[PDB]
Design a protein around this ligand. Structure first.
Ligand SMILES: [Cu+2]
Length: 194
């Protein structure tokens, strides 16, 4: 149980920034994407740590149709479906060589963590996220929990990523295959390469 916390994933970002004031009506204009998410199902944010499928057997693209990447293929009876909405999700700034910080509360380890970034030309404001929009730009292999960095209430690890040629708004897609079970997590993070 965990997520990409920097650059924060869509659910982690909406939880971190609005969890303390999640019924603030100002959200409808200040952050329309978090507003539609909180209105559709607040548990997508309260359960930010649980965006997983089970039994995928490594066939991530088979299990996750285009336009459903950010909800993990509408996993868990649609809890995270509002993360698939197209629009002006809040970004954080990154550089072309950047680091993805993954936080795991449960110390499951990883069989692998893969980091993809959208290709220049993809428009996150207008277009559903497709597998063909993504390029693999960072990856770690089998990494038992004993090798992750100690945190309060879990462990973390940084995955280097290099996305040459990107400028402006993009999406990072991180796939964590946990080691305790065939359980896989699917994290979209909105970023701006400057
Ligand atoms: Cu877990």
């Amino acid at each position: 149980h965990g997520s990409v916390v920097d650059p924060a994933s869509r659910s982690y970002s909406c939880w971190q920034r609005w969890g303390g004031d999640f019924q603030n009506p100002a959200m409808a204009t200040q952050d329309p994407m978090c507003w539609q998410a909180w209105q559709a199902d607040p548990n997508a944010m309260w359960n930010w740590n649980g965006l997983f499928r089970e039994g995928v057997a490594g066939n991530h693209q088979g299990a996750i149709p285009d336009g459903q990447l950010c909800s993990g293929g509408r996993t868990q009876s649609g809890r995270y479906n509002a993360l698939d909405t197209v629009g002006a999700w809040k970004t954080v700034p990154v550089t072309n060589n950047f680091r993805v910080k993954f936080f795991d509360q449960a110390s499951h380890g990883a069989d692998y963590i893969r980091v993809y970034v959208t290709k220049q030309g993809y428009n996150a404001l207008t277009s559903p996220l497709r597998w063909s929009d993504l390029e693999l730009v960072g990856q770690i292999g089998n990494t038992p929990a004993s090798q992750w960095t100690r945190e309060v209430d879990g462990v973390s690890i940084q995955i280097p990523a290099n996305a040459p040629g990107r400028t402006g708004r993009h999406v990072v897609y991180t796939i964590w295959q946990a080691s305790h079970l065939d359980q896989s997590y699917y994290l979209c993070s909105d970023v701006d390469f400057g």
